[PDB]
Amino acid sequence: EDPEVLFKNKGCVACHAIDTKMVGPAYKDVAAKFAGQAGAEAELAQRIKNGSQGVWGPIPMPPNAVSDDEAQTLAKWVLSQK
Amino acid sequence: EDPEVLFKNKGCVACHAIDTKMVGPAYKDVAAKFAGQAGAEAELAQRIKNGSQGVWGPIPMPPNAVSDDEAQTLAKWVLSQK
Ligand code: HEC
Numbered sequence: 001e002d003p004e005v006l007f008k009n010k011g012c013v014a015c016h017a018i019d020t021k022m023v024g025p026a027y028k029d030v031a032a033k034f035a036g037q038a039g040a041e042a043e044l045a046q047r048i049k050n051g052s053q054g055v056w057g058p059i060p061m062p063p064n065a066v067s068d069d070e071a072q073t074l075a076k077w078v079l080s081q082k
Numbered sequence: 083e084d085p086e087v088l089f090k091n092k093g094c095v096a097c098h099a100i101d102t103k104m105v106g107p108a109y110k111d112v113a114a115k116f117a118g119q120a121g122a123e124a125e126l127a128q129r130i131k132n133g134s135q136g137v138w139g140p141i142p143m144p145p146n147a148v149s150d151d152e153a154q155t156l157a158k159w160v161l162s163q164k
């Protein structure tokens with residue numbers, strides 16, 4: 001099997017990242033940054049779906065092929081990180 | 083859909099972790115630690131399959147339900163992190 005496929009399928013993602021510094025911000029840090037903002041869930045869902053740039057650094061996030069509902073589910077989950 | 087399921091299925095894992103500090107060591111750090119050791123791939127495959135404890139801290143890694151071949155594939159990939 002492809003190893004990235006196994007990494008996801010075999011539960012490793014719960015406990016490990018490739019790097020302490022991934023290209024995008026860690027979700028716990030995203031959650032903390034938004035702690036004083038209402039409407040974080042809607043904003044993040046839009047960013048997740050459509051892509052975004054310039055908030056955390058010069059590296060863009062491309063759009064993601066997710067539905068509105070999927071984007072909202074993911075935004076809520078990012079915001080649920082403790 | 084479950085959000086952890088979407089996180090894996092929609093490609094987010096390539097660019098984000100939940101936390102800069104996951105319970106287990108980051109794979110780039112594992113790769114660097116083993117740079118002077120022959121037989122790292124076999125050692126890591128065994129750790130991945132069987133679990134391990136006490137190398138990085140007090141939190142154990144439980145066994146993972148992987149085949150020998152899957153464990154080797156994953157060990158090789160961990161070691162391929164740059
Ligand atoms: C899913 C199959 C994987 C893969 C590929 C790896 N793990 Fe873990 N892991 C966890 C912890 C707490 C540790 C440190 C244990 C200690 O201090 O001894 C590890 C360690 C590793 C390593 C490095 C092993 C070494 O001896 O250097 C590697 C390569 C590794 N893991 C890969 C914690 C977890 C989990 C928490 C519940 C889960 C799930 C996994 N690991 C799963 C995987």
Ligand code: HEC
Nearest residue numbers: 023024052053054055056057059060061064074092094097
């Ligand atoms: C898969 C569907 C996901 C999810 C759920 C998220 N991303 Fe990304 N992301 C990346 C980068 C470089 C950034 C920073 C962009 C900037 O500086 O503006 C982001 C940002 C985010 C956020 C925070 C958005 C904010 O405005 O604060 C969130 C919640 C987020 N992402 C979730 C990089 C990548 C990728 C690299 C190629 C990929 C793939 C994804 N992101 C995918 C996802």
